Amino acid sequence: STGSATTTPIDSLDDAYITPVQIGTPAQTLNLDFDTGSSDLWVFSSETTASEVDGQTIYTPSKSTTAKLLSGATWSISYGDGSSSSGDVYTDTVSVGGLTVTGQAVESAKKVSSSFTEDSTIDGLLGLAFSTLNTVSPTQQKTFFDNAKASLDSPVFTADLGYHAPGTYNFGFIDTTAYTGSITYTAVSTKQGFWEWTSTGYAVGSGTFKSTSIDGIADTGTTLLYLPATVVSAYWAQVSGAKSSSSVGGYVFPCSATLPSFTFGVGSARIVIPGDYIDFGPISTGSSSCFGGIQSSAGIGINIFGDVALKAAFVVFNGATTPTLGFASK
Template sequence: MKTTIAAIVLAILADGAVVRERVDTAPQAPAPGTNGRSFTLNQVQNKDFQGHDGPMSFLRAHFKYAKKLPDYLSKLVEIDPSFRIKFGLGSQADGQIGTVLADPTPLVDTQYAVEIGIGTPPQHIRLNLDTGSSDFWVFSTDTNPSMVDRQVLYDADKSMTSRFLTGESWIIKYGDNASASGFVYTDRVQIGETYVDTQAVQVAVNLTKDLSSDNFVSGILGMANSAANTVRPTPQRTYIHNIKDNLAQPLFTANLQRQAPGSYNFGYIDDSQYKGTITYTPVEPTFPLWMISTTGYRIAKTSHNERINSIVDTGTSLLLLPETVVSSYYAKVKGSSVHPQLGMRLVPCNADLPDFYLTIGSYRGRVPGSYMNYGRISGNSCFGGMQSSGDLPFSVLGDVFLKAQFVVFDYGNARVGFANKKLYE
């Protein structure tokens, strides 16, 4: 029998959790403040890098978006449960701008982590900044101890500004029946020099063991539209939603790098980080994630016209496209093959991979062939950085694509911008 979130909360309260004063559960807008701030949020460097893990990256995307895993992946998970893992899983100032640095995790380029401060005084915690999610959830001292594996824990009791939201809870279920659930506080959250005094912080109480295996990060910072937030009965606002009206411009940019720290800028666009002009495309207005439509692609010198609905997702590592596109690409790679269990595309590690171009309106985004080698599986066999989206309801423009572009997430105007930049091949 499934344990309800109400039962989880009651059990924790019975075990001695502190009951905090009741506050309004409706999301609150940040208060106004002063103008003129700017900051850089850099990626946090993970010094324990051990190399790419292609299967994990592939499965994370399916766990995140698929309603049900394909049969061949379900069988693989049954054979080896270790494959079950989720990716990562004052007053507000007007005119704020800033930058946040993001770092690759030990499985290089599988996640980009940022360090934020929660509470008063601030507790510094690394999170996965995820444009494919609308939940801000963290490991905490309320998390079942058996599910904690060296994560940094948020402690609401040590914050003078934390408030418990009575009656509010959340649950996220993934495609392999993995899940995370818990309750909600509000607290002061600071990212760079921006902050929100009453940001909803979803603390994980129960989660399946496989979700705790990634201890470089201690939760998710969802940066999609608030409409996809899973808190019930009152969905909560995302961090970007809360600060958008107080930024110099209601946007943030991603300048992710290959095997090196990149950055997120909030409230402004740094002209030195890209070449040429920025081309914007609207996001799907009825969908809460950053969904856009691409109009074609090119492999080497061969162009194709095909409309593809895609999520722009910093929380997914691979580039996941329809099988027709994937087949066309690997047909150009001598010695490419398909993994017999995973169904993933493999390439000879020493192969000269072709460049890939994705057309978005008038923009043509290039992914160098060297970026398409995602990591060794054994011997001279490597995983390809482009894989099939298969049964997913849309394609996913993950970090293999994004780290080769300069990307603008324009929250205020519901659009995404792309520009070319200097690449390190």
């Protein structure tokens, strides 16, 4: 089998992407944030505290003839941005882009933190990291990809995120029309449960490429590119007037600037992020200070190849027995 679904930016800055997902019988379609940095499929639901729902579409398990309470199971997750959610668990039929999994754990939120409530466009998350990170207790649950893998034509999914435009998540096949040149594959460590790999270096604009190993994760659920402070300083030093602002929480730059590109290495290959992808706009409405899309990872503990980086490539998440990542230009 295969599946193919369109993913759409939630706003004009590509702050996140939503993909429609059919849950239950008859189908209830919710727009979920596909997140290769976590491993829980959770939804706003009829069980969510009413004051914490503000415009989201909810899953109502009592209206699904295929929903079954997973008795005793609970979940609770906290994300790298400080947001969180928790609740109980049903199994139900879940379909993405024509690909159907029966018996998928659907984690029903009883509580969500303010950032989720405040984003009316995201009805939940669909985790695509390794199932070892799933938070369901006492019986850990598998991701949608893990459950679908055996049925897929090839044990892969691909992320093709758009810049200010829709893109595609495919399951089970590699669309050879969706990229240019060849796909370069690189080794993955699953020891932290992430799609963790080592980039071979970077360049700033037309500058020379610096060969240096940068361990990080391919994370579709993170907006920006988080890299070591040395790398980030070298980038922003090429932008007149750019500075790191403690009050804002990262590098800002004059909105009048033209940003240089940023290149990262995948083996001997190179992915170029155009400068425009690094502009996240005024820090507040009407400000002439703009927020940068490359930020320091120093306060995180891991480097994160988020959407800013991933949207510049066609990315293969290869879930073969030995997983690997593939990157192509497009």
